């Protein structure tokens, strides 16, 4: 008899083909997973860049280093002020 071994080997081949089929299913699933994960990574990356620029703009006493000069101007002015006014008055009223 041959069938008692042939059928055995054929059954083995069948199980084998099932195994390979499972493997190929795995392959398809990975191929789609590539695209899905790619989408998620692209979106998260875009959000990250937007956050980076936004944080660059939201974070990144200008009149403090000038008042010292303004007070100086007012000082120099007020010092010789009354004298100048006095001369101006006595120039208009005295022909």
């Amino acid at each position: 008899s041959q069938k008692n071994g042939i059928a055995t080997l054929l059954q083995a081949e069948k199980e084998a083909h099932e195994i390979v089929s499972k493997a190929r299913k795995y392959r398809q699933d990975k191929l789609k997973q590539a695209k899905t994960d790619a989408a998620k990574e692209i979106d998260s990356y875009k959000i990250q860049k937007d956050k980076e620029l936004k944080e660059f703009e939201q974070k990144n006493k200008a009149e403090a280093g000038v008042q010292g000069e303004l007070a100086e101007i007012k000082k120099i002015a007020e010092k010789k002020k009354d004298d100048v006014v006095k001369i101006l008055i006595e120039t208009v009223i005295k022909p």
Partner: protein, 106 residues
């Protein structure tokens, strides 16, 4: 009419065509690994074939041989084995004075 008087239409089993001898049951169809080879063995080496064919090459199906035909000088066997070992098997068989009959079925 069952008692038919026939005549020699061919030569011996080692060189004759086999289309009128073999039948689909003798072959293993549709298999990624398995295939069938036919071996014409001179009658004086029948016993020699029967106890050595299982190791003529690797991956020979054990106890798979069967007498397909027989004439006055030859006995035609069939053997199932892995396709990738057909070459080694036929070479080894030719080394042991057996005549491997080439038969590519489909």
């Amino acid at each position: 009419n069952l008692a038919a008087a026939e005549r020699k239409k061919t030569g011996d089993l080692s060189v004759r065509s086999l289309h009128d001898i073999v039948k689909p049951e003798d072959f293993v169809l549709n298999s990624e690994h398995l295939t069938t080879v036919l071996v014409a063995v001179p009658k004086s080496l029948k016993s020699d074939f029967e106890k050595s064919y299982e190791t003529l090459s690797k991956n020979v199906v054990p106890a798979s041989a069967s007498v397909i035909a027989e004439d006055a000088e030859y006995v035609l066997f069939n053997v199932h084995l892995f396709k990738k070992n057909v070459q080694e098997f036929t070479t080894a068989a030719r080394e042991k004075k057996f005549i491997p009959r080439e038969f590519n079925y489909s």
